[PDB]
């Protein structure tokens, strides 16, 4: 896989987002795009970086094969730019393989997504 | 398929929803359940009929064997109520065949989260 070096122009953008809770361990991993489109996924026992995975692993299942994508994860970001083969997370593994099947793919970090925010903070 | 004929104790209830622009025929579809999970998607060229059908679809691909679904369509409750072997709408058989798919399914039909879902499927029409 590539990722692509600027915005792909008329893709749908997914602006994803995740939280977790620190004492119940619980959270909620989701999106929204500028089409409208929307998804909210309460998990179990997760971790914040684990909810961002979560996020990214959303919107790559439900995009069509030239996506935008937009975290505010370094974590996440890290990972991904650095084009693993495999890696001991399942999680990530699987991302991986949704890369792979998509014909382009832009991802981008950043410090709308206070949309998604509000959303997976309840 | 059958369908239950009380809420099923464990399954997670999702209140469904759909909505069109009568003029633009713009819609959007989707579900507010019980746990909290979400969801909405834009239609294209559609009725609200179709966008209230959908709705129940997509409700029916994120659960798992045992569904509450509850809508406010009486359009939805009819068609499904009959228990059509086939028709000839594609939706419709697409939805039966999750609904055969499914163990166990109870659908209700209401006129709470079914506002919060309301109010998802209306913003922008």
């Not at 909210?40 to 995975?53: D, G, I, M, R, S």
């Not at 699987?94 to 903070?121: H, M, T």
């Given at each position: 896989?590539?990722?692509?070096?600027?915005?792909?122009?008329?893709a749908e953008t997914f602006?994803?987002?995740?939280?977790?809770?620190?004492?119940?361990?619980?959270?909620?991993?989701?999106?929204?795009?500028?089409?409208?489109?929307?998804?909210?996924?309460?998990?179990?026992?997760?971790?914040?970086?684990?909810?961002?995975?979560?996020?990214?692993?959303?919107?790559?299942?439900?995009?069509?094969?030239?996506?935008?994508?937009?975290?505010?994860?370094?974590?996440?970001?890290?990972?991904?730019?650095?084009?693993?083969?495999?890696?001991?997370?399942?999680?990530?593994?699987?991302?991986?393989?949704?890369?792979?099947?998509?014909?382009?793919?832009?991802?981008?970090?950043?410090?709308?997504?206070?949309?998604?925010?509000?959303?997976?903070?309840?």
């Open positions: 896989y590539q990722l692509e070096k600027e915005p792909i122009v008329g602006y994803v987002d995740g939280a977790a809770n620190r004492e119940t361990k619980l959270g909620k991993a989701g999106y929204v795009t500028n089409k409208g489109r929307q998804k909210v996924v309460p998990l179990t026992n997760t971790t914040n970086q684990k909810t961002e995975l979560q996020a990214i692993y959303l919107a790559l299942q439900d995009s069509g094969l030239e996506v935008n994508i937009v975290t505010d994860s370094q974590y996440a970001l890290g990972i991904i730019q650095a084009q693993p083969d495999k890696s001991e997370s399942e999680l990530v593994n699987q991302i991986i393989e949704q890369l792979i099947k998509k014909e382009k793919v832009y991802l981008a970090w950043v410090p709308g997504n206070e949309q998604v925010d509000k959303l997976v903070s309840a």
